[PDB]
Amino acid sequence: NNTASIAQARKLVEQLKMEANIDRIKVSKAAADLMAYCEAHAKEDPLLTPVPASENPFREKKFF
Amino acid sequence: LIPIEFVLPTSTPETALLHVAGHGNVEQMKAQVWLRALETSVSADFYHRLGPDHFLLLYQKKGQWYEIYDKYQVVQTLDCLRYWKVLHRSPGQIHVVQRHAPSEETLAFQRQLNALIGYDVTDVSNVHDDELEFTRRRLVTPRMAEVAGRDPKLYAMHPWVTSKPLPEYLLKKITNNCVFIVIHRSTTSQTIKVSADDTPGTILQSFFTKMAKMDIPESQNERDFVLRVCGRDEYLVGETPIKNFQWVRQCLKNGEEIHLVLDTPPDPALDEVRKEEWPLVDDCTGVTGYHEQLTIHGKDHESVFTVSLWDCDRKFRVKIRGIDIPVLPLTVFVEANIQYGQQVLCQRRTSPKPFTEEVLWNVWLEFSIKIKDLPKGALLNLQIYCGKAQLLYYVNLLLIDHRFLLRHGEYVLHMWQLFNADKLTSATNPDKENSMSISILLDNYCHPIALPKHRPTPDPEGDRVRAEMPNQLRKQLEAIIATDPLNPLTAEDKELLWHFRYESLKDPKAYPKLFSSVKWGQQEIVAKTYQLLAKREVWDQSALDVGLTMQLLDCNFSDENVRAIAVQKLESLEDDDVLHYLLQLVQAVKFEPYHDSALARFLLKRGLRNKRIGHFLFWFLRSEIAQSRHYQQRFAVILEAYLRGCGTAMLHDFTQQVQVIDMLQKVTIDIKSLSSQVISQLKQKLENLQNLNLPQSFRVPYDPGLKAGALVIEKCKVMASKKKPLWLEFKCADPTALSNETIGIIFKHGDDLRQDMLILQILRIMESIWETESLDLCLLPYGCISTGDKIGMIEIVKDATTIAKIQQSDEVLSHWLKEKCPIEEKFQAAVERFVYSCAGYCVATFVLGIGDRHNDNIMISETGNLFHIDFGHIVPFVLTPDFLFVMGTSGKKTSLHFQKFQDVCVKAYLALRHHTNLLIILFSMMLMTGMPKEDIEYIRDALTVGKSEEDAKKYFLDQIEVCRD
Amino acid sequence: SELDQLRQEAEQLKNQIRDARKACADATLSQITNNIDPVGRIQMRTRRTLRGHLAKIYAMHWGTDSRLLVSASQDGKLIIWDSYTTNKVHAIPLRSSWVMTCAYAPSGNYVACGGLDNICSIYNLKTREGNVRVSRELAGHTGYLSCCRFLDDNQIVTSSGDTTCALWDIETGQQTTTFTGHTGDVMSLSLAPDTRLFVSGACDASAKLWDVREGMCRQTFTGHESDINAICFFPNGNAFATGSDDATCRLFDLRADQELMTYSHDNIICGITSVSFSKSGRLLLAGYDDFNCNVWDALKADRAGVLAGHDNRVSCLGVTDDGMAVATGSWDSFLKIWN
Amino acid sequence: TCTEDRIQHALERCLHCLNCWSLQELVSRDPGHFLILLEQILQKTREVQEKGTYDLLAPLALLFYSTVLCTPHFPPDSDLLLKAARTYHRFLTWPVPYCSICQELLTFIDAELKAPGISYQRLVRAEQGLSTRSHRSSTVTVLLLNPVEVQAEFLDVADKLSTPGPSPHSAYITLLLHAFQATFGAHCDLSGLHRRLQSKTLAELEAIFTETAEAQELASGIGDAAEARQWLRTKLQAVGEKAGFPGVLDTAKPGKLRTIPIPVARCYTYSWNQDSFDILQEILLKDPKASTLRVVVFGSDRISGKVARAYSNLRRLENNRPLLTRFFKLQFFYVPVISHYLGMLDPWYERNVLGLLPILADMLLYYCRFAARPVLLQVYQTELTFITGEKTTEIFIHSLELGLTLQIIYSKGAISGRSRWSNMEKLCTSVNLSKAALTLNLTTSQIKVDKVQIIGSNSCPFAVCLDQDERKILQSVIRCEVSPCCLPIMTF
Numbered sequence A: 001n002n003t004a005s006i007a008q009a010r011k012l013v014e015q016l017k018m019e020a021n022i023d024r025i026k027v028s029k030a031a032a033d034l035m036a037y038c039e040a041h042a043k044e045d046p047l048l049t050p051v052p053a054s055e056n057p058f059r060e061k062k063f064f
Numbered sequence B: 001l002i003p004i005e006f007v008l009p010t011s012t013p014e015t016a017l018l019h020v021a022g023h024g025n026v027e028q029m030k031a032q033v034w035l036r037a038l039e040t041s042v043s044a045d046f047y048h049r050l051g052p053d054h055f056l057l058l059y060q061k062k063g064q065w066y067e068i069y070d071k072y073q074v075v076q077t078l079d080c081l082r083y084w085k086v087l088h089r090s091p092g093q094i095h096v097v098q099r100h101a102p103s104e105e106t107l108a109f110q111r112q113l114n115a116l117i118g119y120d121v122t123d124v125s126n127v128h129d130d131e132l133e134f135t136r137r138r139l140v141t142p143r144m145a146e147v148a149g150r151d152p153k154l155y156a157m158h159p160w161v162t163s164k165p166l167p168e169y170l171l172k173k174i175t176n177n178c179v180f181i182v183i184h185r186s187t188t189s190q191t192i193k194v195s196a197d198d199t200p201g202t203i204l205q206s207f208f209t210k211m212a213k214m215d216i217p218e219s220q221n222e223r224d225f226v227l228r229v230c231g232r233d234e235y236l237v238g239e240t241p242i243k244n245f246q247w248v249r250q251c252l253k254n255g256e257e258i259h260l261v262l263d264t265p266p267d268p269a270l271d272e273v274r275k276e277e278w279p280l281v282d283d284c285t286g287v288t289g290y291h292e293q294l295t296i297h298g299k300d301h302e303s304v305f306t307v308s309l310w311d312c313d314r315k316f317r318v319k320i321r322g323i324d325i326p327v328l329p330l331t332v333f334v335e336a337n338i339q340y341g342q343q344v345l346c347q348r349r350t351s352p353k354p355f356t357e358e359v360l361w362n363v364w365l366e367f368s369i370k371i372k373d374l375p376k377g378a379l380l381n382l383q384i385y386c387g388k389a390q391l392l393y394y395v396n397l398l399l400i401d402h403r404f405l406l407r408h409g410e411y412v413l414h415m416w417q418l419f420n421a422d423k424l425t426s427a428t429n430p431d432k433e434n435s436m437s438i439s440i441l442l443d444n445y446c447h448p449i450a451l452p453k454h455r456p457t458p459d460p461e462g463d464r465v466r467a468e469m470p471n472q473l474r475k476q477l478e479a480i481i482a483t484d485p486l487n488p489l490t491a492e493d494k495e496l497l498w499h500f501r502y503e504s505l506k507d508p509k510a511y512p513k514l515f516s517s518v519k520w521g522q523q524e525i526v527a528k529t530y531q532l533l534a535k536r537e538v539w540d541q542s543a544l545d546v547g548l549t550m551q552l553l554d555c556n557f558s559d560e561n562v563r564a565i566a567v568q569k570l571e572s573l574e575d576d577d578v579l580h581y582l583l584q585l586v587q588a589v590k591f592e593p594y595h596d597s598a599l600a601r602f603l604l605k606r607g608l609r610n611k612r613i614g615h616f617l618f619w620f621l622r623s624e625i626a627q628s629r630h631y632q633q634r635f636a637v638i639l640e641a642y643l644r645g646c647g648t649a650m651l652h653d654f655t656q657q658v659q660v661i662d663m664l665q666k667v668t669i670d671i672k673s674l675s676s677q678v679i680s681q682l683k684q685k686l687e688n689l690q691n692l693n694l695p696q697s698f699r700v701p702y703d704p705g706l707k708a709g710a711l712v713i714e715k716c717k718v719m720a721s722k723k724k725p726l727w728l729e730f731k732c733a734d735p736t737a738l739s740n741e742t743i744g745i746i747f748k749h750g751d752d753l754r755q756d757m758l759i760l761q762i763l764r765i766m767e768s769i770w771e772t773e774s775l776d777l778c779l780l781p782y783g784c785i786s787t788g789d790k791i792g793m794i795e796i797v798k799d800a801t802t803i804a805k806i807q808q809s810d811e812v813l814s815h816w817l818k819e820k821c822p823i824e825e826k827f828q829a830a831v832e833r834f835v836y837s838c839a840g841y842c843v844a845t846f847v848l849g850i851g852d853r854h855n856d857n858i859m860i861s862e863t864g865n866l867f868h869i870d871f872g873h874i875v876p877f878v879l880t881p882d883f884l885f886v887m888g889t890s891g892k893k894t895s896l897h898f899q900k901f902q903d904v905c906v907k908a909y910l911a912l913r914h915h916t917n918l919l920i921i922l923f924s925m926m927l928m929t930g931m932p933k934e935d936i937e938y939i940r941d942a943l944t945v946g947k948s949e950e951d952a953k954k955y956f957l958d959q960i961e962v963c964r965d
Numbered sequence C: 001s002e003l004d005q006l007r008q009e010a011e012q013l014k015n016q017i018r019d020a021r022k023a024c025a026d027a028t029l030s031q032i033t034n035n036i037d038p039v040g041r042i043q044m045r046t047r048r049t050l051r052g053h054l055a056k057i058y059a060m061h062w063g064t065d066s067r068l069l070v071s072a073s074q075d076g077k078l079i080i081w082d083s084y085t086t087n088k089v090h091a092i093p094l095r096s097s098w099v100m101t102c103a104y105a106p107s108g109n110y111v112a113c114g115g116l117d118n119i120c121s122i123y124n125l126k127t128r129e130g131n132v133r134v135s136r137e138l139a140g141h142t143g144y145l146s147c148c149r150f151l152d153d154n155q156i157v158t159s160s161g162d163t164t165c166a167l168w169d170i171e172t173g174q175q176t177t178t179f180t181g182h183t184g185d186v187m188s189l190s191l192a193p194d195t196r197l198f199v200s201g202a203c204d205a206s207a208k209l210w211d212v213r214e215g216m217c218r219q220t221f222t223g224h225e226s227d228i229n230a231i232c233f234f235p236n237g238n239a240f241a242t243g244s245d246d247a248t249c250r251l252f253d254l255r256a257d258q259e260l261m262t263y264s265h266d267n268i269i270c271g272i273t274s275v276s277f278s279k280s281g282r283l284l285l286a287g288y289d290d291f292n293c294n295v296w297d298a299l300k301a302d303r304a305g306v307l308a309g310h311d312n313r314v315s316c317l318g319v320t321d322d323g324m325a326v327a328t329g330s331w332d333s334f335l336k337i338w339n
Numbered sequence D: 001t002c003t004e005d006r007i008q009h010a011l012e013r014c015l016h017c018l019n020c021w022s023l024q025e026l027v028s029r030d031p032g033h034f035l036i037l038l039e040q041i042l043q044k045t046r047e048v049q050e051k052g053t054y055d056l057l058a059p060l061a062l063l064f065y066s067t068v069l070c071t072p073h074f075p076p077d078s079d080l081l082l083k084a085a086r087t088y089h090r091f092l093t094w095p096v097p098y099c100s101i102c103q104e105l106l107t108f109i110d111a112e113l114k115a116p117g118i119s120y121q122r123l124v125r126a127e128q129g130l131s132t133r134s135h136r137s138s139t140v141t142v143l144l145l146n147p148v149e150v151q152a153e154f155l156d157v158a159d160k161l162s163t164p165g166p167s168p169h170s171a172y173i174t175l176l177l178h179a180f181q182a183t184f185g186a187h188c189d190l191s192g193l194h195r196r197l198q199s200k201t202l203a204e205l206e207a208i209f210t211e212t213a214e215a216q217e218l219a220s221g222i223g224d225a226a227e228a229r230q231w232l233r234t235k236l237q238a239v240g241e242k243a244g245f246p247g248v249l250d251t252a253k254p255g256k257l258r259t260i261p262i263p264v265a266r267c268y269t270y271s272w273n274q275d276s277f278d279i280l281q282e283i284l285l286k287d288p289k290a291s292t293l294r295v296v297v298f299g300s301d302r303i304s305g306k307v308a309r310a311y312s313n314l315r316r317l318e319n320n321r322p323l324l325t326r327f328f329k330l331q332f333f334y335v336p337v338i339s340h341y342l343g344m345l346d347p348w349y350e351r352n353v354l355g356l357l358p359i360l361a362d363m364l365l366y367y368c369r370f371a372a373r374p375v376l377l378q379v380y381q382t383e384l385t386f387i388t389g390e391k392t393t394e395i396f397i398h399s400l401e402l403g404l405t406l407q408i409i410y411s412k413g414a415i416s417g418r419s420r421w422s423n424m425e426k427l428c429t430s431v432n433l434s435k436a437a438l439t440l441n442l443t444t445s446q447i448k449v450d451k452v453q454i455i456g457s458n459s460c461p462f463a464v465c466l467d468q469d470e471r472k473i474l475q476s477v478i479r480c481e482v483s484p485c486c487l488p489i490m491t492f
């Protein structure tokens, strides 16, 4: 039962070669990138910024 | 085709080479030879006189005379042809020989057997197919090997060995691992001591050396002697620890001694078995084939001989004609239903009609189920309601016979008359003169509608998918499996269990719920199952549990492989365990739709290999044939197939036992037909029995060793009981019975006993549970048995009196015991025995829900033991104040005795809850096959299923205090 | 030899990945986010309650219109709700009662569902006759359908218990691509903003980034001590969060190829059933198996608030495309909208 | 197309008097129609094979059987017979008789594959007695009629059929023309061979047809059915060249298919004012199975019973002392003008027949050539004991009137096979019995009685009746016992 273990172990090593052949980015820049995204869209997220009840379809009005 | 040389009787027996169609029928083949003989015969006159029926076709399979019984078998499947090709026998040889009529000895033997059974086995009146008869010819082969599988010496002596570990309390009563063997012999009573882990062979060898210089003969040798108990016949031989004998272990608890006596080997020839004549039926007897061979598709119409059941998509359809009751007992209407187990697969009623003694419909009902989706165990259930709606009759019919062929033609069936165990019966009313009759038609077919055998193949689904399921699903999967077997399974569970089938198979405790979901109404789903059960490594090695294997044998699981695996786990039990549940298994053959099975052949091979089992098996089946006519034909066929196996001696013993009972019932009933005249007439009647053939040596039914003898007429009396039992006091017939006492027996008429026999079986099962936990409560199971209808023999417990008599004679109870136990040491010992028994009976009855009774049914022994009687008629249980005063504590105070009362109960109560799986089955399975579901809940209501053990103590004691209240 | 040399080469490339990853681990997100103003307390109120389901709800999914939502339930029905009006636009009864997932198509025309029946049954809301007719039975999987998301009206990705995923073409009913590489049942998935990437969570306690275009595993993320129960992308598409039975959440950035943040608390001991981000992503909404749904600061990793509006396990939850409202389904047979 | 719709439309109308005539006529106009309708049937036949309905199998079996007998030629490429074999071959899993119809039909289809048109040549060769040494067969059609009661139009029909219009020389032309056309189809120029055969003499017409019939049957006797077509086609080449007409074949330019109709068989009309059948006996003056005698008897209630006893006598007389029956095989055909009961069972016979050359005459010929399923009614056998104490057997169907002191013994049956006697002798006035099982009408009681034993007193003579009969009467009876009991009647 070597042809299966070998056929499997080859996929593994051919897969790990795929994943390791990537140019990663420094975490500091990875974070900065994500932090600066929220900073940009903080206004456009009513979950973050409570919006006026008038603009809320779920509080002000029953007719839609 | 094939060449076969057939041997004719004409001189030397003439033989000619013929050929037979490869795909023909057994029957056809016969005609082919008939003509050639009639043409090639030197003197055809003899053949002219007779026909093919007079002769039988025998072929020797390695010296074995086989008979090709079935005349509808495929010629190809004949093992002779298959065997010859393996032998390369060409041309094959088969002989033709005329039949012969039975001789008187054969008729005499058959007449002998029929009297024992209470029925006839050759009766062919109230049947409509050769099922019953096929089985009889079929059970021979197991019984020849089983008989060939017994050894002479051990079979006759039948030691009652055991292999359970010694309980703790007995271990106390074994000092220095030794015991005393009081070897009685003639007059020379020689006493010796021996270790508790030796064997009789060693003891006898040493005993002669000790006495090397008793009435022993000089010429003989130690080879010629074997031990035997005194006052009974229960030999002690076989390589085994002397601690491993249920007899030795019995004395140690009793605080008594062992009294052995030398003996001589009982003669093996005394158990000879009459030679056999019936030829060996075909091995390829139940063989049909696979779907490929039995399907029209892919075949030319010229060579079509059978149709696989799975090729037919026509909706099942049945034509009724009418009903006919000769006696006038309103609106009525038949309501047919396809049932499996207890499931109403489909249903189709008919229009209301006027109620005349005969009502005609001539209507076709059509069933959604499809002929390719018929599960082997179907049962067309037919009802005749009355009108708001009341059931009045019923009847059932298999929709596949015993040889894998659908039912076709006109059938007239005689109906019974009213869930229950008997409402699943596949036999027709023998009352063919005043019984409601139904006439139906099943459509014919130019070919038989066979049904092939499932062909398991490797299943890659169980190979790749490891089913390493998400923890959320694994939580829910194991959430239901924990529940008790009584718990219903909703479809979501059914789908959930079904999908993770190859994973839930790893838990042996989940089987009764894995197979409660399978969809039996669809062929493809069933096909998957036969490969699900193809893998059984987990089940094979799992622990042998008997509170679970019973679940498979229960009614719900009617398939042919679900029950097959259950038996294979019972094949590992041992004689001691078999006897414990033997009454449980026998009443569980009443749910099989077929007659032959693994369960039936299992009881056969066990009885033939053991004697004590054989004795008890015989008196259980006979208790049913006479009682329940619904299944009497099923029981009778097996019983006779067994009586041919056990040697002559047991037959003689069986005959003598039945003779005695026969006379008593007449005397009993005759006396009940109607002061001192009764005893005068009784004794007058009794002294006549001596003048009759009343045997002078007959083993008591409930004790293969304890024989009896003549009556002590002066001690044969009638008690002032409404049902007026007969009291009998025989005297032991054993010459060397050290002590001499009466073998009391009671004969109560007017109360059926099956309810009480089963209960006493239960209380004997519970004892084994506490034995493993090394406890005791001093229960007293007294041998009770049933023999007819409302008639049965009971064992009498010496030195006992009903409490009510003492009551009519709370302090009253205290004085009676002290008078019976004047000595304080014995009096205190009696209280100790009174605490154990009072607690144990209170605990056990509560589990079974019959504790609430009257003091009359409760009787107190002289030795301090207490126990109940007459639990056949039916507060948590009885704890009357008089017990409390005897406990040494009055009101609510406490003493060392009272604390033991409450401590022992707690130990016992929590001991049983470990085996609630075993009790939930036994209890209600009895309720089903016992008296003629809400009532069941008492097993699950107060037994505290799935709760903290501490709360069970609280909840349990919440009843004792209430009983005290 | 041949298998051991490949095993020893394998176990060297792994530490090259750990070393290639440890190199970028210059600072943690907790350091960088120390300065940013904390998110505060997200005091949320139950605006709507969606009654009508008879048993446990297994899945729900917002439509691209941010008003409609489907819900699959143990009671075997697939209901379409009008979140704004609470009215049931459709009450579709199902063939298999063991539905486990649902996914409103982005176009709004199709809805899909599936479960232990091993089929992804596609339903049409806008039918010829105005009926609710089944367009397709995407069959072929050898395990229960665990989750699925529409790429379009004609394409849909589904995950299953076969330890593999697959891309389907709805018209042909054929597995376009098969995503092998996982070693366990795939509990959840999430498509990247670009339809060319999607993540998937499995019981093997690992995540894998797939290229929808090709069908290969690009990166493999670890860190969870238990099954991954839920997974979703960071709004931009460069990070994603995973829910597990180990009572912890984790954030992963695609570019950094490692864990950035853990969202957990000593009190939190039960597994995570579901996750969702707010429109901006500053908020991570985690469902829990204690009837609660705690609100974490995605940057600070501090629990800003708690949604406790369910009587049974909070099985599923979602966020609208506009982040205007949050639905949360549960085993109590009720969904709840929040604002 | 309109033709397909009309052919399909006509099919549905019939299967929902002379409707069957319309369908057969509408398909004979064009050779193509035959290959059109057959397909629509197989679609219907394979539908019931799926839906499994029972009411609509026998009608569809005969329509397929008739059309294949009337099909000119099957294209060598077309294989509509193989499609037919598949649909019917999956009926063996059906109840009897639904599997009875098909198993014979499957045998019929396989013969067509071997020797196409073999079915048509067998029928006509015996319908006109054009037998031969190898092929020996015959058939005779006879009309027994009562001019007093029967309508005039039928007599005209009887006269029309009795005319031996066709001549044996003409018959060979039709048979030989049809045989070659079927094998070769439109390829052959029928007009060219038609002229050739007209010249050749009857003796050589007999020779060619006999060998052709032998070749047609022999090909059906060859194992394979596909190449047998070529093998049979090969022999047809030899006969044409030996006889000298090979040009019409081998025609690269095909000829045309002509719808040859079914020739009328031989018929002989007779008057049947007599209620007996002695007239049949008279004619016999001037193989048992190779010849069949189809006798058609018209319908009238008053004629019925007497026909039954007359029919029974023929069964008695013959079955006991067979004279006519031995020579040939009998087939009777009642014609309402009994039928009530025959209707109740088969709605086909009710509509086609009971619903009642010219169309009416044309439809009748369809009924007699295809109806092949007898239907037998139950009759009562009773024996009368005269004052002399003898025994005379009598058979009655409808009723029985008899007749004051008298001995009556009767028993009541039940479907369950259990019988219960009832012996209540009682003086009465008269005894009447109607066939509702008989019904004992005592005078004023009435009960369905199964077995009855009527015993007189002191050998007292009395008169008895039989189904209200006024001709066959026995009197001076003392006792009688009544209990319920080739030349089959024919229905569909």
Ligand SMILES: Nc1ncnc2c1ncn2[C@@H]1O[C@H](COP(=O)(O)OP(=O)(O)O)[C@@H](O)[C@H]1O
Binding pocket: B721, B722, B723, B724, B725, B746, B748, B751, B782, B794, B795, B796, B797, B800, B801, B802, B859, B869, B870
């Ligand atoms: N094994 C036994 N030993 C002694 N007496 C018994 C035994 N079994 C029953 N009895 C007596 O039978 C009486 C109980 O009634 P029983 O005969 O069992 O039912 P019933 O009262 O309906 O006849 C008590 O008086 C009791 O003494």
